[PDB]
Structure 1
Amino acid sequence: DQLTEEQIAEFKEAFSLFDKDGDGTITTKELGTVMRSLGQNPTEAELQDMINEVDADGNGTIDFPEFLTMMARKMKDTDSEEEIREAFRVFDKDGNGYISAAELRHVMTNLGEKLTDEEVDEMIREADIDGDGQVNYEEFVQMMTAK
């Protein structure tokens, strides 16, 4: 009952990170590219099974509505504990308990978003509640709960 334009913009931004060539469909090559940049090694066949789950029109790729469907199913069903820890591990690359400004910058570049260094620090200071210029695990969890 509505959908806001920034909600639409958020979905478009996510979709466009996978759809690297901007043709409106995500292939196994593209899906694999993102997952590989985040430290994973899916086979071609596994990637195809991922598409198949949501490929409503049967053409072998994911369009925008099919990707929305994917987020509804996968980006919310599991995810509570011991796997939010996996997500933080992606951010906290070296594994010292603290996401530095540079480590955050490294995740954004691997996703596809090549934001400026200034914008990276704007994110840090947003989630940085204890003043040390970094984001520990607890501040990460609280950042995920707010608007």
Structure 2
Amino acid sequence: QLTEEQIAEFKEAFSLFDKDGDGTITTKELGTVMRSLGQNPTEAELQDMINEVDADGNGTIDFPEFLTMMARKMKDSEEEIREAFRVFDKDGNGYISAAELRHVMTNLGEKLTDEEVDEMIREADIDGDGQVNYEEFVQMMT
């Protein structure tokens, strides 16, 4: 089921959202992350999102709720995946390179060794060309 390495990855991803590290993700923090990813949600849109994952309805997202949400890997939109792919593939060539992934990690404020970026690319790469194309990007989250 949910591996322990996934719980490790999701706990790290959670720290990327929870800027102050107070253990909760707020609309403000969700707003800065989304804007760092080239998005631009409104206060209400941001609040709507927290709601779609705020199990106890307290307004903020805790790791349990975030882990729960991630658990919903059972999902799989070709325009929702498409926008995600686009934030990574900055030069728009159809391939996410290690350098592009690094750039998004940077905007997200995550420090990773080149080896670590190669590894992430590695686990998503299927054909072995050392890059991630749309087809491999999709499978990476469905």
Bucket of the pairwise TM-score, normalised by the shorter protein: 0.7 to 0.9
Indicate which of 123, 126, 137 corresponds to 1:129.
Answer: 126
- Separation (CA, whole Å) in 1 of partners of 2:45 and 2:73: 15
Q: Deviations over 1:43-101 (max 9, x none)?
A: 1222122223333444321122222343345983xx34233222221211121222222
Task: Specify the SS of the correspondent of 2:41.
Answer: coil
Aligned residues of 2:86 and 2:92 also touching (Cα < 8 A) = yes
- Please give the alpha-carbon distance, in whole angstroms, between the structure 1 residues aligned to 2:125 and 2:2: 30
* Structure 1 residues 39 and 8, CA gap change in structure 2 (3 angstroms): same
Q: Which segments of 5 or more consecutive residues in structure 1 lack a partner in the other structure?
A: none
1:21 aligns with 2:20: yes
Alignment check: 8 A CA contact 2:7 2:67 kept: no
Further displaced range: 132-141 or 93-102: 132-141
- Change in 2 beyond 3 A, CA 1:64/1:91: same
TM-aligned CA distance change 1:48 to 1:121, over 3 Å? same
Residue identity over aligned pairs, in percent, reads 100
Q: How many residues align?
A: 142
Instruction: Name the Cα RMSD after superposition.
Output: 2.9
What SS does structure 2 have at the residue aligned with 1:69?
Answer: helix
Q: Which runs of 5+ in 2 are unaligned?
A: none
Shift of 1:27: 0.9
Q: TM-score, normalised by structure 2?
A: 0.77
| Inter-CA distance 50–95: structure 2 relative to 1 (3 Å threshold) | same
Greater CA deviation, 31-40 or 10-19? Answer: 10-19
Could you say which structure has the greater relative contact order, defined with CA pairs below 8 angstroms and 6 or more residues apart? 2
